[PDB]
Write a protein that binds this ligand. Structure first.
Ligand SMILES: CNc1ccc(NS(=O)(=O)c2cc3cccc(C)c3s2)cn1
Length: 167
């Protein structure tokens, strides 16, 4: 039993809610919140910008130190950093950005990072301003992640579209 509430059950381990992932993190304070990052951990917009703004830019400061030490992530890769005021940890996961011309087959590799954590709050990777089809992202999620994932979808109309088309 965990403190996630109001989520619609999609499968054995995947649950979904029409919610702001930032507001859900502040309420639940989960062990792991997933950020939809880029390889440089530049959290300017989208989920990343929203999470980072909610940390008062502390996420960006920590991320810049991480990159200065380790260099960029791989597309499909991840790193664990602090969750600041939002969660114990933030798992920064790089899904392919179709608008940048990156390989969509890397979406499965990106979701595999979730399997290293028992319970996560997460967005649909590569969706939104990353340019992939969210119906596809949800399918890859359900077919790849085996741990317990609580998906937050900001767009009300997309949430309804995702539920009603889910096989
Ligand atoms: C197509 N139009 C549209 C509008 C709103 C949303 N919302 S969302 O699924 O929470 C969401 C936003 C976002 C922003 C950056 C990166 C990611 C991975 C995500 S994922 C989705 N799609």
């Amino acid at each position: 039993v965990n403190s996630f509430s109001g989520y619609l059950k999609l499968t054995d381990n995947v649950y979904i809610k029409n919610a702001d992932i930032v507001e859900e993190a502040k309420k639940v304070k989960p062990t792991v919140v997933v950020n939809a990052a880029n390889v440089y951990l530049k959290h300017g917009g989208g989920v990343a910008g929203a999470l980072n703004k909610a940390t008062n830019n502390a996420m960006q400061v920590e991320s810049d130190d991480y990159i200065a030490t380790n260099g960029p992530l791989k597309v499909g890769g991840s790193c664990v950093l602090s969750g600041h005021n939002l969660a114990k940890h933030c798992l920064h996961v790089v899904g392919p950005n179709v608008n940048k011309g990156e390989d969509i087959q890397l979406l499965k590799s990106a979701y595999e990072n979730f399997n290293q954590h028992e319970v996560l709050l997460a967005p649909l990777l590569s969706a939104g301003i990353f340019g992939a089809d969210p119906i596809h992202s949800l399918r890859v999620c359900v077919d790849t992640v085996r741990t317990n994932v609580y998906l937050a979808v900001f767009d009300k109309n997309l949430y309804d579209k995702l539920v009603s088309s889910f096989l």
